[PDB]
Ligand binder design. Structure first.
Ligand code: BCB
Ligand code: BCB
Ligand code: BCB
Ligand SMILES: C/C=C1/c2cc3[nH]c4c(c3C)C(=O)[C@H](C(=O)OC)c4c3nc(cc4[nH]c(cc(n2)[C@@H]1C)c(C(C)=O)c4C)[C@@H](C)[C@@H]3CCC(=O)OC/C=C(\C)CCC[C@H](C)CCC[C@H](C)CCCC(C)C
Ligand SMILES: C/C=C1/c2cc3[nH]c4c(c3C)C(=O)[C@H](C(=O)OC)c4c3nc(cc4[nH]c(cc(n2)[C@@H]1C)c(C(C)=O)c4C)[C@@H](C)[C@@H]3CCC(=O)OC/C=C(\C)CCC[C@H](C)CCC[C@H](C)CCCC(C)C
Ligand SMILES: CC(C)=CCC/C(C)=C/CC/C(C)=C/CC/C(C)=C/CC/C(C)=C/CC/C(C)=C/CC/C(C)=C/CC1=C(C)C(=O)c2ccccc2C1=O
Ligand code: HEC
Ligand code: HEC
Ligand code: HEC
Ligand code: HEC
Ligand SMILES: CC(C)=CCC/C(C)=C/C=C/C(C)=C/C=C/C(C)=C/C=C/C=C(C)\C=C\C=C(/C)CC/C=C(\C)CCCC(C)C
Ligand SMILES: COC1=C(OC)C(=O)C(CC=C(C)C)=C(C)C1=O
Ligand SMILES: CCCCCCCCCCCC[N+](C)(C)[O-]
Ligand SMILES: CCCCCCCCCCCC[N+](C)(C)[O-]
Ligand SMILES: [Fe+3]
Lengths: 273, 323, 332, 258
């Protein structure tokens, strides 16, 4: 029920708020106040989804979709089945995400390690807020947010892109896509490298830190280093959303023509026109 | 905080290190040089690089590929140097605009494209060899090479293989900054919305998962930096607090956990998978699926919505409506 | 580099699909006002007298009109087409029945065409209608027209830079991108799509599976086709100052029914209609035009969506003079 | 006739849809899941008397043993039975099987909770060469501090009590990765010297701030055994020492922040 070595680390403390109250475990799960609020929201949120969906026409998981309100309704509270559920779902979402996060902080203080993980986790929360809270506020309606449906959310992505004619030309999208790609690659190299060194094959000797470093110098002429590739991978993944946010946020509030036309700033410099 | 996790406070400098391989120790060119600024966020040694056959070959094919592209682009602006720098992003070397089926197409309509494509494949292949071979030489496993092959493969997929299946070079990917991009749209358009391709959906998950995992793995490592969490290798052969802590952190959050070695495996697998899932979906498009959305509807998963503005019948499908 | 909020948004789709228009308020106000320059309708005149067919000499088209009514037209025509030029543009100071000057015969065909758009093409123009003004905007040469090659600037009232001139081989790509909202699409949807009834817009399969007999080899359509239609769409979009979702639900561009807006259907007709005017009206005028007017391959200038629309979903924001000049359609 | 059509209502894309899923679950569940259980398994809780017996589900979950042949000799097999022998200065605070534990002594010294170490090997980590990886500058004469960074040798170490705790005497470099990993300081009004991982030191031009523990507490930092070399277990000891103070240096550390 406990790992071979878990026992020793299981001491009280590190709570953010709450203290000894919820400072305990259930199974492998640590609880804590935020563990108590995480559950609360989830519970509400999943029940909201169940009820809302129970009032729609389909149960096919793929086709079910819970949608935000019509623009008409502005930033105000909307009829239940016409956006209301969506609103309340959104709040639970954030409720859960944020508890999740804080929970991770207490888990970290207890263990005596850095806060980098919850910290890192803020990046995806922030993006959820950009799409669902900030952009619509900027545009003036909750009806510009995305719908909760396995496939139907892709339909929002799609049309959203197409509203700007060719989304691919959105400069924050280019930067976004570009981190998405580097990071996916770095992950493969980082993991292949590690495993290549500890699993040479046959019965050859496990290699060393030195070998990791000759490998890449040899290859690309440069090696970042063991700790630094963790710092970099943390940076590339994050920038996927940090940079993207800009692209998203400009679309509508800061820009209304087609993205390609944005590049006129280059193309149209008078010198070379 | 642990400032070490942000940048290196006190940089060390020492003799350069050289691990010997079964071969090519004599093919390492360059005088290693140090950079102080870079030294803060990474190792400071730039160099040297190893040459060798495969590498040099790779430079060779590659470069050929390139002149080919640049030249055709250069022509695209009737060799005006200035409009060249200017329109760059817009210039490209296209696949055959006409249908020639599988026939080696005229140089003007696609011929130069298939050549470029060739030298790029040769170039990719040689580089592959380098990746595989330098691993073998230093007594390392082939893992990186095996992920790389998956990426080569996807590229091949969307360049030769898919065009080969359906029988039209007209479907390959053009070369150029905006052009390779518009291909995406034209490709999706034609095949009925790629959002409906389950393999696009698989790829995306893995890609996002990639994001999620490097972020978490990275952060996890800095968070234990203090216990030497970074010396991953020795943390595998001899578990330490760092990994113990990193394990229980994840155990207590999500209920389960990996090991220091296994996480690299989940990372590697995820990575590979992005590319593998993509290849499947491309190989299946056109060969067996004409319209992804409709294939989805065929099988009952597409969502449907009410009309907002009134339903609009296809004018063409009306009585005595022109063609 | 950026346009500032707020932004006017509209909804064209079910809640949550992200379908609608995104307009910059100032952009619209400038267009609103330039389009506002549409001269008001001339005061009604009462029909006294004999039809001008008895009255005048060479009156082919408007021969049902009285003198008063007819003159009214002539004045309207003058104001919409060649106001700075006056009647003398098309006429001989002394022989008002003289066909000497080319603008007369053109103007004549123009009357027939105009009257056709308003009578035959109701599917597209509805109760709005077109008048000379619509295209001409108070100039003999409409400001938005197309040759058999991408021309630039878009507005012929601007003076071109060295590079924009159709003669400069290097600016071709720029000239092309400008036609397709800045895209790098290597095609010209006008020559391929709008001058002819030759090519097919539609490129997406209507079955989930590749039907055997059309999916392999030379039996196929090149992927070019797809880039082409995309490009055409960017042009249409940019010509109405709109976005794909004004017309389609990107879930399935190919579907109609609840996937398409009533506007798609209208633009459908718009395609036909511009094909008509082009093939049967505007192109045959190269016979009657000065070389000054023709293009590099002896073609007349022809029309596109932009000609009429000038960057607005409804040309002239929906303004009509239809009731005001029945002489121009629709006909019994 | 369509391409891909199989039966009257079946296509190859469908079949591939399931094969993909199945391939995914196979790897995730039967491969990755078992691999994650190479350390720390099998889990812990009571034995009966005669209850030595294997527990069915405990065998299935683990992968086959893997042997690592080590660079400078020896081997390691995982997973393997590795019980924690060491008596822990902790007491259960309640009945719940999942309630926390409490230190019964001075947790820093007793090495419990954040102040815990792993039973790492009592060996010096080596370079590829066979030499010691982490050694003081004193010895790694080939190494230096880069132009422009602080030369912390001679500066005072200031504890979280704001009090001078000793003066930095040397630095320990990783000869294998050219990275400083510890500062060595001489402790005030004492005989010994301690090490403190670089991650715990805030390097400034005039002091080195260490907020982890209090001056008084430097005296108990784990002592090394050879004066110019450190075993892997020792690194864990030393590092955990200071982490422990993050939770335990003061009575309020362990409590709620708000
Ligand atoms: C036709 C429409 C298009 C489009 C439109 C589009 C839009 C409109 C947007 C993007 C965005 C993005 N696009 Mg793009 N796109 C991308 C890639 C990307 C990503 C880099 C980026 C970020 C995704 C995001 O923000 O999700 C966000 C993910 C979130 C917020 C995750 C929240 C997770 C939460 C924190 C935790 C939740 C937990 C679960 C609820 C609970 C589950 C627990 C269970 C499992 C136990 C690629 C690689 C491609 C390719 C190859 O063509 C492409 C094509 C296109 N995109 C088309 C051109 N794209 C975005 C961007 O940045 O644009 C600049 C964006 O706004
Ligand atoms: C700006 C663009 C966006 C976008 C674009 C996008 C694309 C274009 C694609 C997806 C896809 C998917 N997305 Mg979306 N997405 C999803 C969730 C999903 C999953 C259904 C699927 C794969 C996700 C994945 O593996 O990631 C990495 C996480 C991993 C690997 C761990 C497992 C996470 C688990 C899959 C999440 C499950 C969510 C639940 C089924 C529903 C919630 C739980 C219930 C109990 C409430 C959530 C949780 C949210 C937010 C923010 O809350 C979000 C936001 C967005 N996605 C943005 C709106 N997403 C793909 C798909 O197949 O869609 C149908 C796909 O093709
Ligand atoms: C309107 C068009 C759309 C589209 C069309 C599209 C297509 C057409 C394809 C994808 C594909 C993919 N898209 Mg999708 N897309 C994606 C995400 C993705 C990726 C996960 C996956 C691509 C795999 C990849 O990494 O290729 C990037 C990795 C590459 C290219 C590896 C190259 C490796 C190589 C060894 C590097 C060589 C370097 C050399 C130096 C080169 C030298 C050159 C010289 C010599 C000439 C997201 C996140 C979204 C969002 C947010 O909405 C989205 C929206 C859309 N995509 C739209 C719906 N997408 C692919 C897929 O899965 O298909 C099923 C695909 O083929
Ligand atoms: C740039 C960096 C990135 C990043 C980073 C990190 N990511 C992390 C961590 C870090 C570092 C964490 O520590 C945390 C964690 O523990 O890791 C295990 C986590 C997590 N990443 C998740 C999903 C994931 N990350 C994505 C993306 C990125 N991650 C980007 C790439 C995506 C994408 C791309 O789609 C997904 C879907 C969850 C697994 C997980 C906790 C969920 C949670 O909150 O638990 C608590 C909540 C629940 C278990 C359910 C609550 C249900 C709500 C109330 C009801 C439904 C609401 C919702 C509106 C439904 C809409 C669905 C519809 C579209 C279909
Ligand atoms: C899912 C996992 C993924 C993944 C995985 C992996 N990716 C890998 C590996 C793995 C594992 C490797 O091991 C391999 C490698 O080595 O890593 C360091 C590699 C690589 N991924 C690159 C690019 C990349 N990966 C992308 C994506 C993903 N990757 C996906 C997502 C993308 C995207 C998204 O677009 C990009 C662009 C390259 C840097 C690199 C080698 C390319 C090569 O083969 O080089 C070929 C070399 C050349 C063409 C030399 C050219 C020299 C110039 C032209 C000189 C010009 C001047 C001219 C010579 C003047 C002459 C003058 C005369 C007088 C003398
Ligand atoms: C009284 C009562 C009701 C009690 C309830 C208490 C409570 C809060 C229960 C919560 C239950 C809940 C909500 C459970 C949901 C758990 C969730 C969100 C699970 C998501 C699981 C998923 C899909 C994770 C995706 C990422 C992924 C593929 C992880 C697999 C690989 C792992 C385990 C990575 C974690 C990981 C990383 C990143 C390391 O770096 C690392 C380094 C060294 C050793 C280990 C690790 C490690 O495990
Ligand atoms: C070209 C755009 C014209 C301008 C400017 C003006 N008119 Fe015109 N006119 C034009 C045409 C094509 C015709 C033929 C009409 C038809 O139905 O076939 C006419 C005709 C006349 C006539 C009749 C003369 C005759 O046939 O006996 C008159 C008297 C006339 N137009 C007058 C007129 C005036 C006064 C103008 C300025 C106010 C004017 N026209 C301009 C074409 C053009
Ligand atoms: C868009 C559908 C048009 C409408 C409506 C009308 N005209 Fe037009 N006209 C149009 C084009 C594309 C052109 C050809 C390019 C060119 O400048 O010739 C024309 C031309 C004429 C001309 C000739 C002017 C010249 O070549 O110098 C005249 C006199 C003219 N058009 C008259 C005219 C009248 C009277 C209209 C209303 C009845 C009318 N046009 C409508 C396009 C369009
Ligand atoms: C209305 C003014 C439209 C806007 C805005 C856009 N499109 Fe369109 N599209 C429209 C029509 C009338 C048609 C049918 C043409 C015909 O000859 O029948 C189309 C068609 C498409 C298609 C393909 C159709 C098919 O294969 O069945 C695509 C792929 C398409 N359109 C894409 C598209 C995009 C990407 C747009 C924004 C740039 C866009 N359309 C706008 C009308 C309208
Ligand atoms: C002038 C001869 C025109 C050309 C060329 C094209 N269009 Fe048009 N369009 C014209 C008019 C007079 C109207 C108005 C209808 C009304 O009620 O006022 C329109 C309208 C449209 C619309 C309707 C938009 C709406 O808000 O409902 C669309 C969608 C449209 N036109 C598209 C369109 C396209 C795609 C064209 C090029 C193929 C095109 N039009 C040309 C007049 C003229
Ligand atoms: C061997 C058998 C018989 C025939 C095989 C045929 C074959 C293998 C064909 C293969 C085709 C393939 C793999 C095609 C693939 C197409 C793909 C993946 C396209 C992707 C293109 C992507 C992009 C962004 C291309 C960008 C290109 C550029 C911008 C080039 C820039 C070059 C520069 C700037 C050179 C500068 C040089 C200087 C000295 C300054
Ligand atoms: C420990 O893991 C790793 C490193 O540390 C030495 C690297 O330097 C590198 C080299 C990275 C680059 C960008 C050269 C990789 C790939 C890696 O996985
Ligand atoms: C990214 C969109 C993914 C949607 C994929 C939907 C796959 C549906 C396959 C249903 C197969 C039918 N069935 C169960 C009889 O086999
Ligand atoms: C593209 C999405 C595919 C991602 C596959 C996700 C694997 C997550 C597995 C969670 C493991 C669950 N567990 C503990 C019960 O094994
Ligand atoms: Fe790692």
């Amino acid at each position: 029920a406990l790992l071979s070595f878990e026992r020793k680390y299981r001491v009280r403390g590190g709570t953010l708020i709450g203290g000894d109250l919820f400072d305990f475990w259930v199974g492998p799960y640590f609880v804590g106040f935020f563990g108590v609020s995480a559950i609360f929201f989830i519970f509400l949120g999943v029940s909201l989804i169940g009820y809302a969906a129970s009032q729609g026409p389909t149960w096919d998981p793929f086709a079910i979709s819970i949608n935000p309100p019509d623009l008409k309704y502005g930033l105000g509270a909307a009829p239940l089945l016409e956006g209301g559920f969506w609103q309340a779902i959104t709040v639970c979402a954030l409720g859960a995400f944020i508890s999740w996060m804080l929970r991770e902080v207490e888990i970290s203080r207890k263990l005596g390690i850095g806060w980098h993980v919850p910290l890192a986790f803020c990046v995806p929360i922030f993006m959820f807020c950009v799409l669902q809270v900030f952009r619509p506020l900027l545009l003036g309606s909750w009806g510009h947010a995305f719908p909760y449906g396995i496939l139907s959310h892709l339909d929002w992505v799609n049309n959203f892109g197409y509203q700007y004619l060719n989304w691919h030309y959105n400069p924050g999208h280019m930067s976004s896509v570009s981190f998405l790609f580097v990071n996916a690659m770095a992950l493969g190299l980082h993991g292949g490298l590690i495993l290549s060194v500890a699993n040479p094959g046959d019965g050859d000797k496990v290699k060393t830190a030195e070998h990791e470093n000759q490998y890449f110098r040899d290859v690309v002429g440069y090696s970042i280093g063991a700790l630094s590739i963790h710092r970099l991978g943390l940076f590339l993944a994050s920038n996927i959303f940090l940079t993207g946010a800009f692209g998203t946020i400009a679309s509508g509030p800061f820009w209304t023509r087609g993205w390609p036309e944005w590049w006129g700033w280059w193309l149209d410099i008078p010198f070379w026109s | 905080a642990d400032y070490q996790t942000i940048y290196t406070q006190i940089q060390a400098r020492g003799p350069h290190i050289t691990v010997s391989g079964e071969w090519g120790d004599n093919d390492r060119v360059g005088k290693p040089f140090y950079s102080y600024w870079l030294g803060k966020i990474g190792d400071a040694q730039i160099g040297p690089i190893y040459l060798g056959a495969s590498g040099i070959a790779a430079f060779a094919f590659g470069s050929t590929a390139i002149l080919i592209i640049l030249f055709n682009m250069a022509a695209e602006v009737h060799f005006d140097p200035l409009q060249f720098f200017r329109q760059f992003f817009w210039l490209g070397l296209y696949p055959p605009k006409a249908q020639y089926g599988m026939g080696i197409p005229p140089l003007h309509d696609g011929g130069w494209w298939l050549m470029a494509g060739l030298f790029m494949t040769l170039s990719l292949g040689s580089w592959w060899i380098r990746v595989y071979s330098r691993a073998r030489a230093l007594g390392l496993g082939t893992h990186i090479a095996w992920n790389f092959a998956a990426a080569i493969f996807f590229v091949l997929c969307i360049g030769c293989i898919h065009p080969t299946l359906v029988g039209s070079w007209s479907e390959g990917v053009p070369f150029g900054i905006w052009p390779h991009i518009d291909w995406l749209t034209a490709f999706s358009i034609r095949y009925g919305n790629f959002y409906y391709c389950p393999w696009h959906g698989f790829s995306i998950g893995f890609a996002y998962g990639c994001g999620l995992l490097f972020a978490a793995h990275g952060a996890t490592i800095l968070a234990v930096a203090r216990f030497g969490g970074d010396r991953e290798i020795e943390q595998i052969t001899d578990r330490g607090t760092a990994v113990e802590r990193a394990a229980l952190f994840w155990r207590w959050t999500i209920g389960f956990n990996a090991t220091i070695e296994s996480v690299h495996r989940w990372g590697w697998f995820f990575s590979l998978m992005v590319m593998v899932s993509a290849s499947v979906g491309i190989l299946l498009t056109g060969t067996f699926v004409d319209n992804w959305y409709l294939w989805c509807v065929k099988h009952g998963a597409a969502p449907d919505y009410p009309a907002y503005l009134p339903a609009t019948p296809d004018p063409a499908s009306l009585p005595g409506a022109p063609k | 580099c950026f346009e500032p909020p707020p932004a006017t948004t509209t909804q064209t789709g079910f809640r949550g699909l992200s379908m609608g228009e995104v307009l910059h308020p100032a952009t619209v106000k400038a267009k609103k006002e330039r389009d506002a320059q549409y001269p008001p309708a001339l005061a009604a005149v009462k029909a006294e007298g004999p039809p001008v067919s008895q009255v005048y000499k060479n009156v082919k088209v408007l021969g049902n009109l009285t003198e008063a009514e007819f003159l009214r037209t002539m004045t309207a025509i003058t104001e919409w087409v060649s106001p700075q030029e006056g009647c003398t543009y098309c006429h001989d100071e002394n022989n008002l029945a003289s066909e000497a000057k080319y603008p007369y015969v053109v103007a004549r065909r123009m009357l027939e065409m105009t009257r056709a758009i308003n009578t035959n093409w109701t599917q597209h123009v509805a109760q709005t209608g077109v008048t000379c003004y619509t295209c001409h905007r108070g100039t003999p040469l409409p400001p938005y027209v197309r040759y058999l090659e991408p021309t630039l600037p878009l507005n012929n009232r601007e003076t071109p830079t060295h590079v924009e001139r159709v003669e400069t081989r290097s600016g071709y790509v720029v000239r092309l991108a400008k036609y397709t909202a800045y895209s790098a699409l290597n095609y010209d949807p006008f020559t391929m799509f709008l001058a002819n009834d030759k090519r097919q817009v539609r490129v997406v399969p209507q079955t989930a599976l590749p039907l055997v007999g059309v999916s392999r080899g030379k039996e196929r359509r090149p992927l070019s086709d797809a880039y082409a239609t995309f490009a055409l769409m960017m042009s249409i979009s940019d010509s109405l100052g709109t976005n794909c979702t004004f017309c389609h639900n990107a879930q399935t561009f190919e579907s109609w029914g609840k996937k398409s807006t009533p506007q798609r259907a209208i633009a459908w007709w718009g395609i036909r209609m511009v094909r008509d005017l082009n093939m049967n009206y505007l192109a045959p005028l190269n016979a009657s035009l000065p070389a000054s007017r023709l293009g590099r391959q002896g073609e007349a200038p022809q029309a596109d969506c932009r000609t009429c629309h000038q960057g607005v979903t409804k040309p002239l924001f929906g303004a009509s003079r239809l009731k005001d000049y029945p002489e121009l359609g629709p006909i019994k | 006739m369509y391409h891909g059509a199989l039966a009257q209502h079946l296509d190859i894309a469908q079949l591939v849809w399931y094969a993909q899923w199945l391939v995914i679950w196979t790897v995730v569940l039967l491969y990755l899941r078992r691999e994650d259980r190479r350390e720390g398994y099998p889990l812990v809780e009571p034995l009966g008397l005669v209850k030595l017996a294997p527990e069915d589900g405990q065998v299935y979950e683990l992968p086959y043993p893997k042997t690592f042949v080590l660079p400078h000799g020896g081997t390691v097999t995982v997973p393997r039975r590795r019980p924690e022998t060491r008596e822990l200065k902790l007491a259960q605070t309640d009945g719940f099987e999942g309630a926390p534990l409490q230190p019964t002594g001075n947790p820093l010294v007793d090495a419990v909770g954040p102040a815990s170490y792993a039973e790492r090997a009592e060996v010096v980590d080596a370079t590829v060469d066979g030499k010691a990886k982490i050694v003081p500058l004193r010895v790694a004469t080939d190494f230096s501090i880069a132009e422009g960074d602080v030369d912390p040798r001679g500066l005072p170490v200031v504890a979280a009590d704001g009090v001078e705790a000793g003066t930095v005497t040397d630095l320990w470099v990783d000869r294998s990765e050219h990275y400083f990993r510890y500062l060595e300081l001489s402790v005030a009004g004492s005989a010994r010297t301690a090490l403190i991982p670089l991650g715990f030191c805030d390097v400034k031009k005039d002091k080195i701030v260490v907020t982890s523990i209090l001056s008084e507490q430097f005296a108990n930092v784990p002592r090394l055994q050879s004066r110019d070399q450190i075993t892997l277990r020792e690194e864990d000891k030393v590092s955990a020492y200071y982490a422990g103070g993050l939770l335990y240096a003061t009575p309020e550390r362990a409590e709620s922040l708000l």
